[PDB]
Design a protein around this ligand. Structure first.
Ligand code: GNP
Ligand code: MG
Ligand code: MG
Length: 232
C-alpha cells in the first residue's frame, strides 16, 4: 500500500536488448548473468552461460512456462524477473512468433501472470526440473514495481542504444521507476560508457549503476538503488 514507508516486497523486471542469436550477435547483453549473480552470488551457483535458444519442450516446461521471461527467484523481499526472448532450436525464430508482441512492448509489461511458474537455475534444469529445487513464482503473478534497463558497454553499440532508447520510452509510459545498469564493465569501453551516460542525462533523474556480473561489482547496488527509488 502506497501510504507505507517500505512496501517490503519489490518485484523487479530486468530488461534490455533481446531477440534472436543474430540480433544479439550470438552474445546477449548480460541480463541473465546479472540476475544470477544477484540471486545466487556464490561461485558454485553462478553460470556464465545461459542460452536463450530452446527446444519446444524446454519452452513448454514449468520453468519457462510458455513465457519470454524467467523468474530468477527471491532475495531476502525482492522477486526478480528477466524479460528476454527465446528462440526455437531448429527454426531459429522466436517461440510463438506470430502470437508475440514485439519485445519492447512485452518487456514493459507490469502485470506478469504465469501460474505455477518455477524458479530458473540454468538451461540444464529445463525438462529435468525434478533434478532441481522447485520454488514457484509467488501467487502465479507479479505486479512489477520497477525496471533495471541493461546496456552492454563491453568491447553494434549504436544500434543497441537506439533500441534502449525505444525500450526506455515504453518503460517511461508505465511511470514505474527505472535505473540504467551498465553491464560487463570489466570489459567496458569508455566511449560506450560515456554514450550511455549521455543518454541517461537526457532524461529526468535517470540513475546509472556500472556493473560486472563476471567480476561481481555493483550487482547488489544496482538492485538496491532501484528499491530505494521504488519507495520514494
Ligand atoms: N565480460 C563479461 N561478460 C559477461 C558479463 N555478464 C555476462 N557476460 C557474457 O555475455 C554473455 C551473455 O550474457 P547473458 O547474461 O546470458 O545475456 P542476456 O542478456 O541474458 N541474453 P539473452 O538476450 O539471450 O537472455 C554471457 O554468456 C557471458 O559470456 C560480465 O559482467 N562481464
Ligand atoms: Mg538471458
Ligand atoms: Mg511507497
Amino acid at each position: 500500500r502506497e501510504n507505507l514507508y517500505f512496501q517490503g516486497t519489490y518485484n523487479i523486471s530486468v530488461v534490455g536488448l533481446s531477440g534472436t542469436e543474430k540480433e544479439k550477435g550470438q552474445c546477449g547483453i548480460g541480463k541473465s548473468c546479472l540476475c544470477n549473480r544477484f540471486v545466487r552470488p556464490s561461485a558454485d551457483e553462478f553460470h556464465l552461460d545461459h542460452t536463450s535458444v530452446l527446444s519446444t519442450s524446454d519452452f513448454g516446461g514449468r520453468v519457462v512456462n510458455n513465457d519470454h521471461f524467467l523468474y530468477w527467484g527471491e532475495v531476502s523481499k525482492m522477486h526478480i524477473v528477466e524479460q528476454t526472448e527465446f528462440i526455437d532450436d531448429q527454426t531459429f525464430q522466436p517461440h510463438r512468433s506470430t502470437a508475440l508482441q514485439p519485445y519492447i512492448k512485452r518487456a514493459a509489461a507490469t502485470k506478469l501472470a504465469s501460474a505455477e511458474k518455477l524458479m530458473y537455475f540454468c538451461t540444464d534444469q529445463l525438462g529435468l526440473e525434478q533434478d532441481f529445487e522447485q520454488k514457484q513464482m509467488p501467487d502465479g503473478k507479479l505486479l512489477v514495481d520497477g525496471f533495471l534497463l541493461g546496456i552492454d558497454v563491453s568491447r553494434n553499440f549504436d544500434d543497441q542504444l537506439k533500441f534502449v532508447s525505444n525500450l526506455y520510452n515504453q518503460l517511461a509510459k508505465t511511470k514505474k521507476p527505472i535505473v540504467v545498469v551498465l553491464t560487463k564493465c570489466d570489459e567496458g569501453v569508455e566511449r560506450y560508457i560515456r554514450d550511455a551516460h549521455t543518454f541517461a542525462l537526457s532524461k529526468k533523474n535517470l540513475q546509472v549503476v556500472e556493473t560486472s556480473a563476471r567480476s561481481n561489482v555493483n550487482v547488489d547496488l544496482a538492485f538496491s538503488t532501484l528499491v530505494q527509488l521504488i519507495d520514494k
